[PDB]
Design an enzyme around this catalytic site. Structure first.
Site, PDB file in Angstrom:
ATOM      1  N   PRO A  76       0.780  -1.223   0.000  1.00 23.28           N
ATOM      2  CA  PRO A  76       0.000   0.000   0.000  1.00 23.28           C
ATOM      3  C   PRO A  76       0.814   1.277   0.000  1.00 23.28           C
ATOM      4  CG  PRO A  76      -0.172  -1.123   2.122  1.00 23.28           C
ATOM      5  CD  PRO A  76       0.672  -2.009   1.237  1.00 23.28           C
ATOM      6  N   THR A  77       0.291   2.284  -0.665  1.00 24.78           N
ATOM      7  CA  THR A  77       1.002   3.533  -0.764  1.00 24.78           C
ATOM      8  C   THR A  77       1.255   4.080   0.616  1.00 24.78           C
ATOM      9  OG1 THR A  77      -0.235   3.941  -2.785  1.00 24.78           O
ATOM     10  CG2 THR A  77       1.005   5.826  -1.875  1.00 24.78           C
ATOM     11  N   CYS A  78       0.395   3.770   1.554  1.00 27.70           N
ATOM     12  CA  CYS A  78       0.544   4.341   2.866  1.00 27.70           C
ATOM     13  C   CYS A  78       1.771   3.809   3.583  1.00 27.70           C
ATOM     14  CB  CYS A  78      -0.708   4.101   3.669  1.00 27.70           C
ATOM     15  SG  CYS A  78      -0.753   2.380   4.167  1.00 27.70           S
ATOM     16  N   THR A  79       2.447   2.816   3.023  1.00 27.59           N
ATOM     17  CA  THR A  79       3.711   2.362   3.605  1.00 27.59           C
ATOM     18  C   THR A  79       4.869   2.685   2.744  1.00 27.59           C
ATOM     19  OG1 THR A  79       3.357   0.108   2.661  1.00 27.59           O
ATOM     20  CG2 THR A  79       2.870   0.456   4.913  1.00 27.59           C
ATOM     21  N   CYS A 108      -5.117   1.100   3.130  1.00 25.21           N
ATOM     22  CA  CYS A 108      -3.952   1.029   3.980  1.00 25.21           C
ATOM     23  C   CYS A 108      -4.302   0.079   5.104  1.00 25.21           C
ATOM     24  CB  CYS A 108      -3.661   2.375   4.533  1.00 25.21           C
ATOM     25  SG  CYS A 108      -2.201   2.393   5.544  1.00 25.21           S
TER      26      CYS A 108
END
Lengths: 169, 174
Positions: free
Chosen positions: A53-56, B29
């Site tokens: 995920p982009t959030c990581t 996320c």
């Protein structure tokens, strides 16, 4: 380590699916030895998981963003992004990241993590399952100029980052 | 072996990432949740488990998965399916993205499970060797009703066959 030794291709093969875009492609097998013998300046960078995920953290978008500089300015022939994911997923991921052309950037599957394990850049995820860790490698004229893996691939983008690599180009 | 036997959960676990309405068309996320198959079966009377060889297998290639997705409402609403678990050996993030790319907007009743190293799928002999000790899941379906495997079928050529793994074949056993 591997730095200043010949790139250890062995018999290891990766699969990737071209993206032309420039408009159902299927996985092409490519021997590391051939890729490396045929390309003077190769960046190879491992990622633990397609569609992480982009959030990581991820180093891969850096490579995509700087692709043009790498290829045009730093004469990088091939950036191989390496995962253990299947080649369709890696292709889909590449597109998801804005790869429109695999001339110089290929999202390789390294099935079973075998090449990645063979250089000890694997990431044990339990029960003898191996993803790739997060690492980058520069091979120049068949020689490993740079090889480093994150100690914590889940939080760290240091040695695998395009910036670090760019410093060795 | 499997039909009319207790579902062979063993210690096998899978991972999946949920897709809720808060994130169906957005980038998620979410941490993969790890779920032991025994836990899945324990909590769901009626489960369809179906393997696929590869998340993001090209849309031009035959697949049974879209049928599961298209029939999902029916399966849940009319066949009281509690879960459809789509199994691949791909990483749960890939799988979840795949699920999204197939229109899955809600994992309440369908989950795209990772079966890491194909261990569960191998364990039921429904894998697909693909080179050098690497296993993908074959293409197969299985129905588990009250902990009992009521239907298990693997395609012979997952590359080309969507017969017994199909939601229709399954539908015709629910």
């Amino acid at each position: 380590d591997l730095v200043n030794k010949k790139f250890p291709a062995g018999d290891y093969k990766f699969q990737y699916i071209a993206i032309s875009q420039s408009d159902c492609k299927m996985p092409q097998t490519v021997e590391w030895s051939k890729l490396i013998s045929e390309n003077k300046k190769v960046i190879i960078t491992g990622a633990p998981a397609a569609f992480s995920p982009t959030c990581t953290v991820s180093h891969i978008p850096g490579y995509i963003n700087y692709l043009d500089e790498l290829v045009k300015e730093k004469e990088v022939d091939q950036v191989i992004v390496v995962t253990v994911d299947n080649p369709f997923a890696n292709q889909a991921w590449a597109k998801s990241l804005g790869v429109k052309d695999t001339t110089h950037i290929k999202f390789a599957s390294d099935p079973g993590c075998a090449f990645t394990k063979s250089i000890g850049f694997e990431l044990a995820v339990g029960d003898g399952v191996y993803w790739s860790g997060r690492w980058a490698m520069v091979v120049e004229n068949g020689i490993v100029t740079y090889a480093a893996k994150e100690t914590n691939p889940g939080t760290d983008v240091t040695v695998s980052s395009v910036e670090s690599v760019l410093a060795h180009l």
